[PDB]
């Protein structure tokens, strides 16, 4: 994709993630920004970003559990 | 701390099984059982998501 298209893809991924972060992962609340993300990014990049998101979220859950024993 | 070393070792042995069998997890079911038995559930989910990510990142 062009430099512009890459920036629009990365910004649409940032807005979608920012949606999921702020709204405590309710993803049926970010269907508009998910559409924008899917329309803006190469299919391979959407797959890469979704897998990276899952990794980072579960890593955060893992490190949280270690820092705050109950 | 022992339990923690055991879980990391189990995750290493399972992952090395996946590497040697080109990611056919069905070839590594006994090591998968050992991994699940040695690690907290929260950790297994983290490691599984790391593995899914790193294997996909390899195509690039």
Author numbering:
A (entry chain B): 50 to 119
B (entry chain A): 52 to 111
The authors write:
Coa6 is a soluble IMS protein with a CX9C–CX10C sequence motif, which binds Cu(I) with a KD(CuI) of ∼10−17 M. Coa6 deletion in both yeast and human cells results in diminished COX assembly and activity; however, this defect can be partially rescued by exogenous copper supplementation and in yeast by treatment with elesclomol (via a proposed elesclomol–copper complex). Here, we present the crystal structures of human Coa6 and the pathogenic W59CCoa6-mutant protein. These structures show that Coa6 has a 3-helical bundle structure, with the first 2 helices tethered by disulfide bonds, one of which likely provides the copper-binding site. Patients with mutations in Coa6 suffer from mitochondrial disease due to complex IV deficiency.
To elucidate the atomic structure of the WTCoa6 protein, we crystallized and determined its structure to 1.65 Å resolution by X-ray crystallography. The structure shows two monomers of WTCoa6 per asymmetric unit, arranged as an antiparallel dimer. Each monomer is composed of a 3-helical bundle, with a coiled–coil–helix–coiled–coil–helix (CHCH) fold. The sequence of WTCoa6 includes four Cys residues (at positions 58, 68, 79, and 90) in a CX9C–CX10C sequence motif, which in the crystal structure form two intramolecular disulfide bonds per monomer, between Cys58–Cys90 and Cys68–Cys79, in accordance with the fully oxidized state of the protein. These disulfides tether helices α1 and α2 together at each end of the helical pair. The Coa6 dimer has buried surface areas of 701 and 656 Å2 (for molecules A and B, respectively), which are 15 and 13%, of the total surface areas of each corresponding monomer, indicating that WTCoa6 forms a stable dimer in solution. In addition, Tyr97 of monomer A (Helix α3, cyan) forms a π-stacking interaction with Phe111 of monomer B (Helix α3, gray) at the dimer interface. In addition, the structure of WTCoa6 shows that the Cys58–Cys90 site is proximate to positively charged residues (Lys53 and Arg55) and bordered by aromatic side chains (Trp59 and Trp94), which partially shield the site from the solvent.
